[PDB]
């Protein structure tokens, strides 16, 4: 889906499989967190479905020894003194000692400030202990989390439930047309992008000799040249668009290991899973009611949440019993208007826009004369069309698909291409669609705050700030204090301070809240990027202080208060909203759950050959399953006729379904249901 999803997949630890265990043979004890998983397997990143606990992610600093166990680094404490000597310990080796928490107060020389410190002991015991007892201590605060989990800012303010969803949904982000790095980051986004392998890093230092959208050439110091080719508009495994773009220009000195071009979900070498959106936390006329989302139409007009998707369509021409299927533009009983987008071979041409039902590859298969309906043979006689012994089996566009044809690939047995035995030709057509954000598409943040799009108002309807800039997204307030994910609120505050900038009062010394902040943070320009590492990072005292000294806008006015709220105007009426509302910038991701794929409907269609019931799945143009529990609901209502209609004429009545379709197009009434064909099969199986 995105580079992070691929990196996480290569670092997965699966308990299922041969030699492991069966899913039916896995109690609630194999799945829960074990105290030895600290710094080895992440306790957060795990699916919430039937594979919960059975699939984990490797911790960041963890590694595997040649024996098979997982080692994690620790700082060796000599005599109550922290040393820079680092040694990797296994699970039982860690139990034979006691380790101090990463955030321990430490002297500049290495001695612990408090005699008693929070220390982890064997069998999952946490307690204070003398400073002369600490044998090792953790390397980093984020030592216990996964790469994706380490990407959640203010993770320490989010409960484990929504944190699990926050990391699991980052892997579901869709690569957008243009990518924006988040204002509020954690620092992991850089190494997560580079180590993923979907960017282009320079192997050796040198200068850029020639740069194009197609390739980048690097002139090394020794004299050799290496040229890196860009992957442009490639279809990923899940239909997303893997597209690399050069960053450097002509004649730029670039060091070894530096990102010279970044791909999907990347901005200047950092993971860009979403966009920075101006958010307001308020209920708005019920359109954002319980987890629905209201969006500004600016995100549609400016392609902020527009994504490219590519589908692969395939068809082959085989040898049949009565001849051979041939791919030809000549298709029986088709006008020259439908075949207008095809070349002379029967293939759609590059660049053509194809809706659903359009022909992509014209293939005809010869059908025998003894396979003809009596009406079809009479219909063939009353039209005088002889020599039409072939029927239409062309590759058409499925329901719900539409886009531009970007690529064609043809494989022919005639042209030395090795096809499976019995195949004469193979054609693959790649269709690309440009999907803007739509009502019902699923958005989400990094703190497990998910929701679909319930309404996209015009830009003037949006509640706008004092200077006229309308907000981009409205999030319901009710769905915030239940989930225990305050991190989204703290991100909104820090996000605004990043957008506007700040300046701490330097006169009369450094204030008492900014005493712990680095000197690089006392001043910030607008649109600055910051890092809040997991379990470290910004504290609420420093965050409260930054809101008090936010930079003014171009007119010199401060729009948000020290509380973090701002005065908004109702774009529909004009009256300002009675109370200030929390306003800031939040990083929102577009998840791969779009209504363009999830919508489906069927009048009639294919039926399973054995049971004579409608097919399943959208791809097979199947129907919905009126299950066992749904029949109890009809019976509870007493809706006898609706229930009988569902289970007979609408499903597996072979003669009833056809006579119902005729009765509708005739305007007649609905006939009487017959006997289900599935019940006939049951009897023939009991026999």
């Amino acid at each position: 889906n995105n580079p992070l999803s691929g990196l996480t997949h290569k670092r997965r630890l699966s308990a299922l499989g041969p030699g492991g265990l069966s899913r039916e043979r896995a109690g609630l004890e194999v799945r829960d967190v074990h105290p030895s998983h600290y710094g080895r397997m992440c306790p957060i990143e795990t699916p919430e479905g039937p594979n919960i606990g059975l699939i984990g992610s490797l911790s960041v600093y963890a590694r595997v020894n040649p024996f098979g166990f997982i080692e994690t680094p620790y700082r060796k404490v000599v005599d109550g003194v922290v040393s820079d000597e680092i040694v990797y310990l296994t699970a039982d080796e860690e139990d034979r000692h006691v380790v101090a928490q990463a955030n321990s107060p430490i002297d500049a020389d290495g001695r612990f400030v408090e005699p008693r410190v929070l220390v982890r002991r064997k069998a999952g015991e946490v307690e204070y202990v003398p400073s002369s007892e600490v044998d090792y201590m953790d390397v980093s605060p984020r030592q216990m989390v996964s790469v994706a989990t380490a990407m959640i800012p203010f993770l320490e303010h989010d409960d484990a439930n929504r944190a699990l969803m926050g990391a699991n949904m980052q892997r579901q982000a869709v690569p957008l047309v243009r990518s924006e790095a988040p204002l509020v980051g954690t620092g992991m986004e850089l190494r997560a992008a580079i180590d993923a392998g979907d960017v282009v890093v320079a192997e050796e230092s040198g200068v850029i000799e020639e740069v194009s959208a197609d390739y980048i050439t690097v002139m090394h110091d020794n004299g050799t040249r290496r040229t890196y080719r860009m992957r442009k508009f490639a279809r990923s495994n899940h239909g997303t668009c893997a597209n690399q773009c050069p960053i450097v220009d002509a004649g730029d000195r670039v060091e070894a290991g530096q990102v010279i071009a970044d791909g999907p979900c990347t901005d200047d070498g950092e993971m860009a899973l979403g966009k920075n959106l101006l958010v307001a936390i308020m209920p708005w006329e019920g359109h954002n009611y319980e987890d629905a989302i209201i969006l500004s139409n600016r995100l549609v007009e400016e392609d902020v949440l527009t994504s490219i998707h590519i589908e692969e369509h395939e068809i082959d021409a085989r040898d049949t019993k009565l001849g051979a299927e041939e791919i030809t533009r000549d298709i029986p009983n088709i006008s020259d208007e439908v075949l207008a987008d095809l070349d002379e071979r029967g293939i759609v041409r590059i660049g053509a826009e194809v809706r659903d039902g359009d022909i992509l590859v014209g293939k005809v298969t010869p059908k025998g004369e003894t396979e003809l309906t009596p009406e079809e043979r009479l219909l063939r006689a009353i039209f005088g069309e002889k020599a039409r012994e072939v029927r239409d089996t062309s590759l058409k566009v499925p329901h719900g698909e539409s886009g531009k044809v970007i690529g064609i690939r043809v494989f022919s047995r005639e042209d030395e291409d090795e096809l499976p035995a019995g195949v004469n030709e193979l054609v693959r057509v790649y269709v690309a669609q440009k999907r803007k954000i739509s009502d019902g598409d699923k958005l989400a943040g990094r703190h497990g705050n998910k929701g679909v799009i319930g309404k996209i108002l015009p830009v003037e309807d949006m509640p706008f700030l004092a200077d006229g800039t309308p907000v981009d997204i409205i999030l319901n307030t009710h769905g915030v204090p239940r989930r225990m994910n305050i991190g989204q609120i703290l991100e909104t505050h820090l996000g605004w301070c990043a957008h506007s900038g700040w300046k701490v009062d330097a006169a009369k010394g450094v204030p008492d809240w900014a005493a712990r902040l680095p000197d690089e943070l006392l001043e910030a320009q607008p649109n600055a990027i910051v890092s809040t590492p997991v379990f470290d990072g910004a504290q609420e005292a420093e965050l409260q202080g930054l809101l008090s000294c936010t930079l003014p806008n171009r007119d010199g006015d401060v729009l948000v208060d020290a509380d973090g709220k701002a005065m908004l105007f109702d774009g529909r009426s004009g009256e300002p909203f009675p109370y200030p509302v929390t306003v800031g910038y939040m990083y929102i991701m577009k998840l791969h759950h779009l209504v363009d794929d999830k919508i489906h409907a069927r009048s009639t269609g294919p039926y399973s050959m054995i049971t004579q019931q409608p097919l399943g799945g959208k791809a097979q143009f199947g129907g919905q399953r009126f299950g066992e529990m749904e029949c109890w609901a009809m019976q509870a209502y007493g809706a006898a006729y609706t229930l009988q209609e569902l289970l007979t004429i609408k499903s597996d009545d072979t003669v009833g379904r056809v006579k119902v379709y005729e009765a509708i197009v005739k305007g007649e009434n609905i006939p009487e249901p017959g006997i289900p064909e599935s019940f006939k099969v049951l009897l023939k199986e009991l026999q």
Partner: peptide, 23 residues
């Protein structure tokens, strides 16, 4: 600053603890 090793954009960190071992 955060991650000043490959030549990345200068992301400023609210870090109070030093990183002894890099990822």
């Amino acid at each position: 600053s955060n991650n000043s090793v490959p030549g990345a954009p200068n992301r400023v960190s609210f870090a109070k603890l030093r990183e002894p071992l890099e990822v």
